[PDB]
Amino acid sequence: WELTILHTNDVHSRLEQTSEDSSKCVDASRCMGGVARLFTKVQQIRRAEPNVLLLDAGDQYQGTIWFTVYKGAEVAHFMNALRYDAMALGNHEFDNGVEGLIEPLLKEAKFPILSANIKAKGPLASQISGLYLPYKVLPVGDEVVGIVGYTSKETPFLSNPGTNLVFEDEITALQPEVDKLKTLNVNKIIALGHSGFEMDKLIAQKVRGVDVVVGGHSNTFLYTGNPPSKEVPAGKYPFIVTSDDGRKVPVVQAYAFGKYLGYLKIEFDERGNVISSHGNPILLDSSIPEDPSIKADINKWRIKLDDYSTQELGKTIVYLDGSSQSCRFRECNMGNLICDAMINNNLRHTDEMFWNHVSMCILNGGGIRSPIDERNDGTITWENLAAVLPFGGTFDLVQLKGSTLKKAFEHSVHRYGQSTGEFLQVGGIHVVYDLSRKPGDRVVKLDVLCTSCRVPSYDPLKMDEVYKVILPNFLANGGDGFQMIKDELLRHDSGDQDINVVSTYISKMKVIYPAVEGRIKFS
Amino acid sequence: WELTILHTNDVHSRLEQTSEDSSKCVDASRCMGGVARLFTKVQQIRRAEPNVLLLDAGDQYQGTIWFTVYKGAEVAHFMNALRYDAMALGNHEFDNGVEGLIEPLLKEAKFPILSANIKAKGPLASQISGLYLPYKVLPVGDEVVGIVGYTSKETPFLSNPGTNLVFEDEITALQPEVDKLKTLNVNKIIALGHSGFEMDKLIAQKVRGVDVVVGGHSNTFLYTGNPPSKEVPAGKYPFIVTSDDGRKVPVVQAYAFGKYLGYLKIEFDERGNVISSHGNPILLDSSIPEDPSIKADINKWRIKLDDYSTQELGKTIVYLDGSSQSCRFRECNMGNLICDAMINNNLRHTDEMFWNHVSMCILNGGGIRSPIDERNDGTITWENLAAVLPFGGTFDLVQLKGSTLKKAFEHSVHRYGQSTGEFLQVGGIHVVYDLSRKPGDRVVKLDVLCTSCRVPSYDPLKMDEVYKVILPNFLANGGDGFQMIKDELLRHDSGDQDINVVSTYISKMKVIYPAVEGRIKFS
Ligand SMILES: CCCCSc1nc2c(N)ncnc2n1[C@@H]1O[C@H](COP(=O)(O)O)[C@@H](O)[C@H]1O
Ligand SMILES: CCCCSc1nc2c(N)ncnc2n1[C@@H]1O[C@H](COP(=O)(O)O)[C@@H](O)[C@H]1O
Ligand SMILES: [Ca+2]
Ligand SMILES: [Ca+2]
Ligand SMILES: [Zn+2]
Ligand SMILES: [Zn+2]
Numbered sequence A, B: 001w002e003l004t005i006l007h008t009n010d011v012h013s014r015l016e017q018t019s020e021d022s023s024k025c026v027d028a029s030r031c032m033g034g035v036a037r038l039f040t041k042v043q044q045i046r047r048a049e050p051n052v053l054l055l056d057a058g059d060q061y062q063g064t065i066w067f068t069v070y071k072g073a074e075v076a077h078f079m080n081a082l083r084y085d086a087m088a089l090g091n092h093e094f095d096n097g098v099e100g101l102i103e104p105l106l107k108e109a110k111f112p113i114l115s116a117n118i119k120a121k122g123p124l125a126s127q128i129s130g131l132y133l134p135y136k137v138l139p140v141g142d143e144v145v146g147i148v149g150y151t152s153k154e155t156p157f158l159s160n161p162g163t164n165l166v167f168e169d170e171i172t173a174l175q176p177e178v179d180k181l182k183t184l185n186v187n188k189i190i191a192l193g194h195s196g197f198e199m200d201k202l203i204a205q206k207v208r209g210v211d212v213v214v215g216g217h218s219n220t221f222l223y224t225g226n227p228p229s230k231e232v233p234a235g236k237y238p239f240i241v242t243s244d245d246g247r248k249v250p251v252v253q254a255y256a257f258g259k260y261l262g263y264l265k266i267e268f269d270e271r272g273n274v275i276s277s278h279g280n281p282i283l284l285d286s287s288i289p290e291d292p293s294i295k296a297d298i299n300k301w302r303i304k305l306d307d308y309s310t311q312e313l314g315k316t317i318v319y320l321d322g323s324s325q326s327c328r329f330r331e332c333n334m335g336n337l338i339c340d341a342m343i344n345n346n347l348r349h350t351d352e353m354f355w356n357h358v359s360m361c362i363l364n365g366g367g368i369r370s371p372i373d374e375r376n377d378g379t380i381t382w383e384n385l386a387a388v389l390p391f392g393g394t395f396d397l398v399q400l401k402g403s404t405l406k407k408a409f410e411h412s413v414h415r416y417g418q419s420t421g422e423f424l425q426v427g428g429i430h431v432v433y434d435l436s437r438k439p440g441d442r443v444v445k446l447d448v449l450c451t452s453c454r455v456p457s458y459d460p461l462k463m464d465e466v467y468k469v470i471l472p473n474f475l476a477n478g479g480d481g482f483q484m485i486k487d488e489l490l491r492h493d494s495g496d497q498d499i500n501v502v503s504t505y506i507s508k509m510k511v512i513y514p515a516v517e518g519r520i521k522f523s
């Protein structure tokens, strides 16, 4: 019995086709992804193959103005139009709190939404009961397939789920549900979830009875053969795990941003054992036409985005100096504003051990692409912010040793004076440079804002300590020559869209007035 | 023909009786003021004297939780109960914008509200037309008296009137209105207004046809004889100005906070010339009973204040360190929070020459009387803030030369180490002390945030420059040994209530996390 699994993950609000690097589409003949093109390919496959499941492994929420304006209603609408068969909850599905999940998505989706390791308490438990499920048994052809969901246990540190949800260890929560399905004579089991490739491999190894793992979160690209685009595979597709019980369990993921459709064919025997599997993600490039009806619907929904983009978000009473002559040479108030917004976006529910889990931010000055002039009655719109931050990136959370962060600050000024983009703007960090010293030895003081303290204050950076830092995805991936960040980081989770982080902060503050205050000094 | 003028000014929300120093009443047998006691005295005088006008010279708004909760409705209600005959607009009547004046007060008062030098434009001009007036002609006995109002031209820098009101020079606006009254055969003219004693004397000298000036704003105490309490007279009551035309024009004011009722008897001839005048403010002490009916009404209205005082204003995720061991010895995050709130409260509509008119704050650490613990789910209530700031003061705007501010910072540490209250918390100021130097020579660096700049940044304090600084009224009056501030300041305007400044900021921010960030350092 042959099953075709089509799967997406970490689509992150890329409803419209994108450029090759998942930023805004500019040259249509070279654009990729989007839901209209996905529809064409899914429909084609469903014409030809009898036993098809279309699955999403989470993180449809967050990533473009679509999510800012429609807040998940676009996810329900377009996933319903595609006829997804099931979705697992990702961390970003909690970005607008549990109510921002229930109302736009759980109540509107025409497919089951799954997570076995999220447990509710208090009145919420009654309010949400049955709106997401630990698993669903789905009819496929003349057979049935069980799908058991899971969501990163780190979600409370990455999103805004509130204090009435408990995120249990994935393997601990999954095993009893898989065991239950076995007792109900469901012998074909897919684990669909949102914890990252490393956890996916552990689930494949340790959760007895799982036949295939369909994952997400880590934006992992897997491929068998020559890759079709610029993404570099982390492993073959599928990635085969040898389980504790000796079975071969395929693990799949399909990058992010709707650029690829995962495609896995599995051959099962009559007892539900995987005999073999093979496939590859399908690049959704311009050789696949956008479905005209979906495209027309997208264009209709875009009108409200255009309208929103020119509305006042808030006001500034200061010039927002995002000039290169400032931001590539010294502390600039636009950089301070953006870092302050990054930290504010990452205020998460703490225990008593930390005032907040993260206090620190770095931002390459070359990422700041425009000033904003305060003389238009102080108004700031989304369009103004999109001129400052035009790359379509995210502000991500990483863990870095102090030694790595010192190397990054040396890199920031190693060729100072040439208006290069690597000069760092900061938050929660006070740095002093002495440019008369040799490159590599110019950082003479580096103090950081504590997190494990009830009163935030600055102390010297410690070379062995691990620090949480918010920074652009561009830097987390080693852009601007920051190879030490890519190579030495100890954890990396994708964050919110850059423009939206700043827009939310401005709207919360209403009137902003960022100063240059001595975060960066020169001896 | 004899007229008795009863007058109040700068009552500032002191609806309930107060202590001798106008803070919260503690020992009832020694408390003073309040509207119930005022009612008793006004009613008594009106039984005995045939020709009485009860006038208010502005600034009923702002000063206690009464204003925070009732937003001016309490002013209309209790002034109506007293049967005020007229009121001039003060600067604080604009604290909640023009709409916060129109709705609670202008539309509800049963007496004319006056200002001849405020001109409206745009749609506001039609919306407000006739709701305040330049003057009113009032029948008194068998005669008539004209009352012409005025309001500080500095109101745009002191309050929130918006950009559709123009505050004209007082003398320029008053003269044509007084001239008009003369043509209507109104020969007895009172100028009632809110610009300060110095401007009141200029109006008396220069506005031809004004017979008596009843003022406010400067909290000026005038008295003929031995003073009855602790206020020190600035001059006799009335203060006699010799006008340009040779007439003797009495000028009166009655301190602030409802502690005194001004009382002036004027003898007019048949042509409306003042033959003589005499009087004195009446101390509203415990020898005058509180009117039982007004007192019972006050007690009924107080219930909603009690309820409000325990409601959550916002949250903190950090411990708010208002301990003396911190705030009298080093930078403390409670001090930073309070100074940040002070600056935020003083954001006013600027021209293009300044991002804001004021950027700088000082706060004596001895004025910070409690920490606030973040472990009660982060909640902050008014009652918590009242423990931090229990003195009933205001955060005022002053102009100080840099040399004066340097002397103040030397005073801040002149006997450092004894846990004395004069140690300064700051905003918009970065100070470095070297305590090994002699007292008086311990300030080694003092940088301040610019105002006449589009991008706020820090520069050295200049000894000759004049700076605007927000600070407690206690310091503006020379408390804590800061005699240089009292003696050398170049301007002083009373600001908003201390607790309300902080409560408004917390409610705007929703979640606060003030840090210790290097505003104060020691070599
Ligand atoms: C191969 C792709 C590189 C594209 S560059 C670029 N991508 C991004 C991005 N995705 N997120 C943030 N900053 C970026 N920048 C910044 O742009 C500067 C160059 O700009 P310029 O030519 O004006 O000097 C660089 O030094 C960087 O700091
Ligand atoms: C004659 C009236 C003085 C009353 S004192 C006082 N009034 C106020 C006030 N009205 N606004 C602010 N701070 C005040 N303090 C501060 O209180 C400290 C003494 O407190 P302590 O006895 O705990 O050392 C002083 O060093 C001051 O900084
Ligand atoms: Ca099986
Ligand atoms: Ca006259
Ligand atoms: Zn994601
Ligand atoms: Zn994720």
Ligand SMILES: [Zn+2]
Pocket: B010, B012, B059, B092, B217, B494
């Ligand atoms: Zn006043």
Ligand SMILES: [Zn+2]
Pocket: B059, B090, B091, B092, B194, B216, B217, B218
């Ligand atoms: Zn005033």
